[PDB]
Ligand binder design. Structure first.
Ligand SMILES: *[C@@H]1O[C@H](CO)[C@@H](O[C@@H]2O[C@H](CO)[C@@H](O[C@@H]3O[C@H](CO)[C@@H](O)[C@H](O)[C@@H]3O)[C@H](O)[C@H]2NC(C)=O)[C@H](O)[C@H]1NC(C)=O
Ligand SMILES: *[C@@H]1O[C@H](CO)[C@@H](O[C@@H]2O[C@H](CO)[C@@H](O)[C@H](O)[C@H]2NC(C)=O)[C@H](O)[C@H]1NC(C)=O
Ligand SMILES: *[C@@H]1O[C@H](CO)[C@@H](O[C@@H]2O[C@H](CO)[C@@H](O)[C@H](O)[C@H]2NC(C)=O)[C@H](O)[C@H]1NC(C)=O
Ligand SMILES: *[C@@H]1O[C@H](CO)[C@@H](O)[C@H](O)[C@H]1NC(C)=O
Ligand SMILES: *[C@@H]1O[C@H](CO)[C@@H](O)[C@H](O)[C@H]1NC(C)=O
Ligand SMILES: *[C@@H]1O[C@H](CO)[C@@H](O)[C@H](O)[C@H]1NC(C)=O
Ligand SMILES: *[C@@H]1O[C@H](CO)[C@@H](O)[C@H](O)[C@H]1NC(C)=O
Ligand SMILES: *[C@@H]1O[C@H](CO)[C@@H](O)[C@H](O)[C@H]1NC(C)=O
Ligand SMILES: *[C@@H]1O[C@H](CO)[C@@H](O)[C@H](O)[C@H]1NC(C)=O
Ligand SMILES: *[C@@H]1O[C@H](CO)[C@@H](O)[C@H](O)[C@H]1NC(C)=O
Ligand SMILES: *[C@@H]1O[C@H](CO)[C@@H](O)[C@H](O)[C@H]1NC(C)=O
Ligand SMILES: *[C@@H]1O[C@H](CO)[C@@H](O)[C@H](O)[C@H]1NC(C)=O
Ligand SMILES: *[C@@H]1O[C@H](CO)[C@@H](O)[C@H](O)[C@H]1NC(C)=O
Ligand SMILES: *[C@@H]1O[C@H](CO)[C@@H](O)[C@H](O)[C@H]1NC(C)=O
Lengths: 831, 55, 812
């Protein structure tokens, strides 16, 4: 049967036995923290063919291979992902290999396989034919690749049984575990699955088939499954479900949950963005006018919001059928998360109180609050009521928002940093121009310590580079020039021109903006300015300047200036390297090269220049004498024994104030009124709006360095990019390594013999070895000949044989691998 | 306009740059320049800085 | 000559000559605005010794040292002062040093030296031996200090001609300039005037002496000077004058209404309560006439001891007191000396930005603030933004009266609100104030005194939780549903304040969870404080909401212990075969006292493929922060946190040819490092570090943070343990036989056999699979002749040394 949701095995092998009735899992299937049960080879689950979301394995002790758990697991669909990963293998002790030898086609996600100290057969898997996005894998830690051995089945037997495929420069047999190969379909079944005996699957199939060209024989479907038939899309009587199957409305009505809903042909737990149920509990949905109106009623009439998580039960809302009492103190992430929880609240039917909310500098987190109905009111008919907010500075951006109060008075008290002009502008737009009077707006305690009037710091000049902005503004001098102590320049990455000052800034010190200070220039002719550096090319920054000033005169005679928020786009630049160049040759003379966009798109990416050049072979291989022992996989033993602060700025302000007053005392007391190496040709091509290309007309098994440069609308001026590069290997030509002529034997003095064979015409790289198997009626003896020995003598000597019906066969080992064994040669030794 | 700090003494020295600055000697028995020219809304005067020169 | 009443050296270096034969200035000394440097500068004045009031230098051009002008200026007595300062050096150009090298004492006055852009000897003067009130100095506007260290004669003449001292806790040479160092003297004159000959001079001495103890040769007198001798108090027929000297009457009788004589001192007019006598019109006699005082500006701003000292001895002040003491450390004692006699302020009193006032009690004997002029809003007593103000006097010893005008109190954080209401009680101003004028919000915000008490009735504890209850407090005024606020903060130690701070945020700041008194009268109010880390000590104090009171004592309650987090960042090494060193860190969350770490280790078998590989087979050896960064790091953080949430619910219960091996276990209690011994050579061991705590007996140790550590190879343990043996074999072949090493490093993967008739040209490979089948290897089909061979075992760790050679022979 089908199983789910979300299988989770968490303590012991006995809990695994939930799986043996499961062939498809409509969930993840975690297995975590299992202690070794000493039941060994028990607890196999061969019924399992598909995991829909993601397989996650953590700390499962004693599990030597997942092929023992899920021998027939064929597809991990990745409909839901574990942080973009569909297969996760973390801290899995004793795990020698992944071993999921029937896993063919992971439909979505990446494969993180982390810190599994004994895990081998990772590099033997060509995930590029299991996965579309190998670049996201993150195979970090595990057993070091130099210590794995990774021998494929048949390799140690000299009878390799697995397929080979190029991953960049590397071309070796592909395997899941020491005994089993990775199953790959022949080239004829283009983008199809196939059965075990090579016969192509039905086009709508996935992974494997019991019988070819049959919709009913699939172990997994691409697109959808219905009554055993794989289907491109659900038959019109049925609806798509959990990313993999078709179920009738009579099924989707019966799932426990208001029940599941049907929309755009698929059945879901809740109807998606912009759609709402027909009415009450009903299966069909309609598009919504705005975000779909949700009532958010609470049995408590007044919902207190006193911590950032206390608003979490709003979670997304449209109409709060009660009253709000915001009370937020501390937390430093407040507005950016209060907007996550409450920004969608369009209507508050009761009153809104903002009391002791010392964290908030702006109520703009209540982004979409269009109405406060005030059907219920606190006391004295108050409907919007803020009290004792030590850091409130703004209510809403009244240049943009049209809040309205249907009934009740507005009230504001003890808001040192929130200006009475701002609360008046609120009442000018909220429809409350005459509800409250006198003491409701006392003006004694609101804005008492706020900069409520500002001159404009006009930007005089701007200059940009790939990583710099140099900006200046008009010379500002308040009536007392002394009280301008510095300018603060606030800049932030602002892709869109809607950023106001209070995008953050909640009273916890640092905020979303970066900021840097400019002292008043000593030379009166020089204009103030800043060089912002460390910026990103082509990105738009919101930059604005504020004058840091004293308050000595009070009575609002302080005039703290602001600049207008200037959106400056840094110059477009040479793009960074195009990330994760990866290549695979589906044929000799061809190379599919794929990559990802550059880490920084330093301009509107126009195209990519792909640049392939051949590479010389000799300077590593041509003298290596491969018929001698390589360095053994020796293991390493363990080794390795044994921004100015607010207080600072307040100190500067206080020292400036004390200097000002003492200069005043100076003047008013002193002054008295009178009474084979070659550089192969480059090749270049331009690819537009496509992060992959098929380089063609190449050589058999030839190493091509592929440079890739991303380009933007500045390419003619600045060049394209620093090359990201991959050394790509073309697929070998079949049979190009088998000897092109009949081998010959010839006599030598004493018991020795000589054998001679011609060099291959177009070898798949250098022929680094020639193996000779020889013996009488049995190839009882091995020998091998280096490339150098052939370049010396042609053939090779066989030493001190015995008379008999001796036989020999020869096999060239090129850089791609061994070619076909030659036809046998018969020879004998004289008496 | 107003002259307060470095500017006030620089202007005063430019006004009286050889005439010199006056001294009280009041015989043991008043807002000042930093008030008439800077701190109050009164504003400074090139025709009143002359009053603080010695003559 | 002794010169007074004060010298304005102004506009002229040629006018600087006025000091040519002055020795004591009975007043201030001003050197002001002289611009004609290169036209004149040549002046020096050795005769100057004492300045009674203060020295002010302002924008003097081209003066490269006051050591040019005043080499012998010895004392500044500060009897009258310039904005708390006895020495002011301001906006001087090319000053380059102070150079007052013989100024051994400055009495009752701070030093400010500001905006002298070339001054390079300001920090090297140990003012602690010049004036007592070093806490009031303002050297802030100095030249940038990037160039002025160690320039003293302690280094300049290639080795010291100087001395060194401590300031704060730093330690440096002390000098005024080059060629001179500060004239300190030994501790035996530690309260005496010293000498140039380093003998302790007269007890009543202040400056310096040339002879060792020759009294009447004190360059400056302590207390009072008279007729060439110092005296602790003026002789019985002499009178104190201008705060430095005694005079016979015929001087104070000849100062151009004449100075009076009273209390043994001579001043401009009789103090409060006294009037000049009839027909003896020199002496003072008691009336009680109150001395009224006034200013041209109807508001006197008091920012300094000077602005207060203009009222010295006054009793009634016509005008408004704008008390503005922003930085006057300890100058409340001076403010008391001046203003502690003003019984009546006719106008308003405004204490604004007066951060130096911890208490208003310096207004001694103040009795009425009549409010005959009032601020905007009709205020007569206005108190704003006084960060440190704690008391308006008005304690149970003296009563104020405010005849007219309202009271205002805003932003006085350390001022108990009980005091501002007690002020209404004491002054009778109950009928004036609004709730907008006296605020419970911004007054009493910090450092509040307290009389009402809330008691912790019961507490309960869990891994992540604290449950706290207290009494149902209510006064006889059963006003409201009194709201109780529980303040909880991580308290690593019990040296914790209340929320008596302005730290709204930063690191550990007192979190506040509000709670309401439940309507059910039986239930004591309680809070389930949650989200608390295991085993952390949290200070909790209850408080009450709207006269009132009700604070609790701080309870340093500790959450119950939990299973520790993983021991972080485990690392390992091997200095020695059969031993490992393992090191880690205290876990991310100890969740208890780290009483001990469990360390378990287990042999991993040699990798199974090593027994299968047949290492003599072929291989090919092919070779050759912005929002986005913060988001990527946060995604990685969540990825780590899910697995921590996985294994922190996992607990370990401590102990009460090759397949598998048993575990080994140790309690290590000292530190985050251990030595594991008696191990197998070159064997991989899983080192499961299990952080544990005092509650292990109930909860168990942490799930292991493993590291796979390989012991170093035992040298001389994988070379063949004996002489190789050989046999002749059929078909011109040899067999080499050799024992397997008793304890090879990991395994023996293969044996190399070097063989040759004279030199070992030829090489043969023997895999473990073949060796375990034949006890050796067959060197097949060698050419007949005399031969030599050597065998090298290649283990999992490296080569064993080539064995003793075997000289076999093949026969033709
Ligand atoms: C593994 O199987 C899948 C189909 O089962 C092969 O086709 C790939 O299917 C994925 C669907 O996960 C396609 O990705 C995108 O899916 C989203 C829905 O999340 C859709 O909105 C996009 O338009 C797109 O379809 C992907 O394009 C598709 N790739 C190809 C080449 O058809 C997949 O190729 C198989 N893996 C391997 C290594 O062959
Ligand atoms: C410098 O001289 C003054 C003047 O004597 C000393 O400061 C205080 O002066 C008053 C009035 O004469 C005495 O009552 C105090 O006892 C003096 N202070 C001390 C600590 O005795 C001052 O001590 C002298 N030295 C320094 C380094 O300032
Ligand atoms: C290898 O290092 C270990 C660990 O330092 C040494 O063993 C003991 O280590 C402890 C702690 O450092 C010392 O207090 C002991 O004195 C050490 N033992 C001895 C006998 O000195 C060990 O000595 C080192 N060397 C070898 C060969 O094991
Ligand atoms: C599997 O199904 C059988 C009946 O087919 C049932 O008896 C058994 O309990 C099931 N086991 C699980 C784990 O679902
Ligand atoms: C609001 O004002 C009206 C009219 O003054 C009054 O009747 C009512 O009680 C007040 N409060 C509410 C909650 O309606
Ligand atoms: C708010 O209403 C005013 C007046 O009609 C209009 O100018 C402004 O565009 C409106 N804003 C929004 C967001 O609807
Ligand atoms: C501006 O629009 C962007 C576009 O999605 C949005 O993310 C952002 O919240 C809006 N407001 C501000 C202040 O940037
Ligand atoms: C940056 O862009 C501006 C656009 O006005 C252009 O004038 C300037 O030359 C550019 N500078 C560089 C270094 O690309
Ligand atoms: C290789 O793939 C490309 C497209 O990716 C295709 O055009 C080409 O024909 C393929 N070559 C072979 C031999 O299948
Ligand atoms: C760059 O691309 C964006 C998004 O496609 C587009 O809106 C913009 O107009 C483009 N600008 C240029 C100069 O190509
Ligand atoms: C200084 O001494 C001279 C004697 O040469 C005398 O005439 C003069 O009055 C004294 N005082 C001043 C200020 O010159
Ligand atoms: C100080 O020296 C003078 C002058 O020689 C002398 O008259 C006096 O006696 C000396 N003082 C003492 C205490 O000897
Ligand atoms: C409390 O004492 C500890 C002792 O190490 C000290 O580190 C800490 O700074 C002290 N905290 C306060 C507020 O005094
Ligand atoms: C924990 O350690 C502290 C010292 O840091 C000690 O006072 C206390 O008694 C210890 N408690 C336990 C249970 O070990």
């Amino acid at each position: 049967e089908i199983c789910g949701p979300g299988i989770d095995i968490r303590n012991d092998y006995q809990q695994l036995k939930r799986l043996e009735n499961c062939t498809v899992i409509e969930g993840y299937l975690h297995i975590l923290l299992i202690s070794k049960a000493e039941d060994y080879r028990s607890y196999r689950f061969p019924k399992l063919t598909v995991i829909t979301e993601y397989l996650l394995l953590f700390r499962v002790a004693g599990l030597e291979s997942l092929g023992d758990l899920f021998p027939n697991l064929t597809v991990i669909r990745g409909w839901k992902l574990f942080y973009n990963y569909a297969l996760v293998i973390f801290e899995m002790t004793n795990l020698k290999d992944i071993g999921l030898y029937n896993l063919r086609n992971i439909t979505r996600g990446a494969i993180r396989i982390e810190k599994n100290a004994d895990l081998c057969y990772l590099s033997t898997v060509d995930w590029s034919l299991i996965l579309d996005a190998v670049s996201n894998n993150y195979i970090v830690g595990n057993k070091p690749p130099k210590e794995c051995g990774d021998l494929c089945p048949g390799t140690m037997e000299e009878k390799p049984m697995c397929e080979k495929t190029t991953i960049n420069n590397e071309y070796n047999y592909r395997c899941w575990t020491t005994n089993r190969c990775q199953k790959m379909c022949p080239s004829t079944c283009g983008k199809r699955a196939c059965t075990e005996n090579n016969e192509c699957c039905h086009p709508e199939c996935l992974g494997s088939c019991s019988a070819p060209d049959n919709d009913t024989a699939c172990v997994a479907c691409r697109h959808y499954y219905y009554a055993g038939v794989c289907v491109p899309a659900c038959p019109p009587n049925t609806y798509r479900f959990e990313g993999w199957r078709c179920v009738d409305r009579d099924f989707c009505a019966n799932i426990l949950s208001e029940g599941f809903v049907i929309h755009d042909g698929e059945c879901m737990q809740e109807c998606p963005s912009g759609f709402i149920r027909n009415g009450s509990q009903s299966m069909y949905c309609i598009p919504c006018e705005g975000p779909c109106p949700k009532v958010c009623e609470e049995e408590k009439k007044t919902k207190t919001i006193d911590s950032v998580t206390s608003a979490q039960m709003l979670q997304g809302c449209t109409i709060f059928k009660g009253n709000l009492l915001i009370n937020i103190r501390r937390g430093n992430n407040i507005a950016s998360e209060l907007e996550n929880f409450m920004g969608l609240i369009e209507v508050v039917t009761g009153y809104v109180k903002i009391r002791h909310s010392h964290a908030l500098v702006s109520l703009s987190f209540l982004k979409n609050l269009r109405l406060i109905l005030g059907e219920e009111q606190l006391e004295g008919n108050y409907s919007f009521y803020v009290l004792d907010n030590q850091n409130l500075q703004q209510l809403w951006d009244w240049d943009h928002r049209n809040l309205t109060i249907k009934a009740g008075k507005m009230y504001f008290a003890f808001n040192p940093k929130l200006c009475v002009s701002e609360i008046y502008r609120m009442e000018e737009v909220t429809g409350t121009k005459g509800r409250q009077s006198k003491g409701d707006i006392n003006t004694r305690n609101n804005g008492e310590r706020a900069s409520c009037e500002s001159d404009v710091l006009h930007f005089t000049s701007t200059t940009t580079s790939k990583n710099r902005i140099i900006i200046t503004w008009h010379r500002y001098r308040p009536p007392d020039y002394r009280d301008l102590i510095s300018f603060t320049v606030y800049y932030k990455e602002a892709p869109f021109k809607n950023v106001t000052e209070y995008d953050g800034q909640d009273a916890c010190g640092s905020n979303s903006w970066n900021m840097v200070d400019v002292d008043l220039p000593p030379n009166k002719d020089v204009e103030p300015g800043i060089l912002l550096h460390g910026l990103k090319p082509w990105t738009q920054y919101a930059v604005y300047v504020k004058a840091v000033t004293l308050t000595m005169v009070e009575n609002d005679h302080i005039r703290g200036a602001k600049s207008e928020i200037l959106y400056i786009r840094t110059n477009a630049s040479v793009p960074s390297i195009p990330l994760d160049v990866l290549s695979a040759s589906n044929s000799s003379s061809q190379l599919i090269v794929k990559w990802n966009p550059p880490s920084l798109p330093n301009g509107n990416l126009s195209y990519y220049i792909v640049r392939w050049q051949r590479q010389p072979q000799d300077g590593y291989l041509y003298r290596h004498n491969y018929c001698s022992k390589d360095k053994i996989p020796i293991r390493k033993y363990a080794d390795g024994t044994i921004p100015k602060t607010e207080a600072e700025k307040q100190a500067e302000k206080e020292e400036a104030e004390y200097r000002k007053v003492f200069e005043n005392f100076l003047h008013n007391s002193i002054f008295v009124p009178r009474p084979l190496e070659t550089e192969y040709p480059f090749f270049e091509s331009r690819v537009d709006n496509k992060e992959r290309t098929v380089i063609s007309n190449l050589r058999p098994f030839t190493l091509y360095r592929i440079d890739i440069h991303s380009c933007n609308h500045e390419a003619e001026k600045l060049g394209c990019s620093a090359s990201n590069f991959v050394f790509a290997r073309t697929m070998p030509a079949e049979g190009a390594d088998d000897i092109p002529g009949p081998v010959t034997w010839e006599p030598r003095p004493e018991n020795s013999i000589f054998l001679k064979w011609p060099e291959p015409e177009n070898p798949n790289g250098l022929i680094l070895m020639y193996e000779i198997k020889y013996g009488s009626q049995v190839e009882d003896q091995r020998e091998c000949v280096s490339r150098q020995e052939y370049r010396k003598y042609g053939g090779a000597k066989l030493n001190r044989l015995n008379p008999g019906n001796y036989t020999a066969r020869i096999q060239a080992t090129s850089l791609s691998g061994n070619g076909s064994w030659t036809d046998p040669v018969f020879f004998y030794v004289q008496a | 306009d107003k002259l307060c700090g470095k500017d006030l003494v620089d202007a005063l020295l430019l006004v009286c740059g050889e005439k010199g600055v006056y001294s009280p000697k009041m015989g043991y028995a008043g807002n000042g320049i930093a008030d008439v020219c800077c701190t109050s809304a009164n504003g400074c005067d090139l025709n009143f800085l002359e009053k603080f020169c010695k003559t």
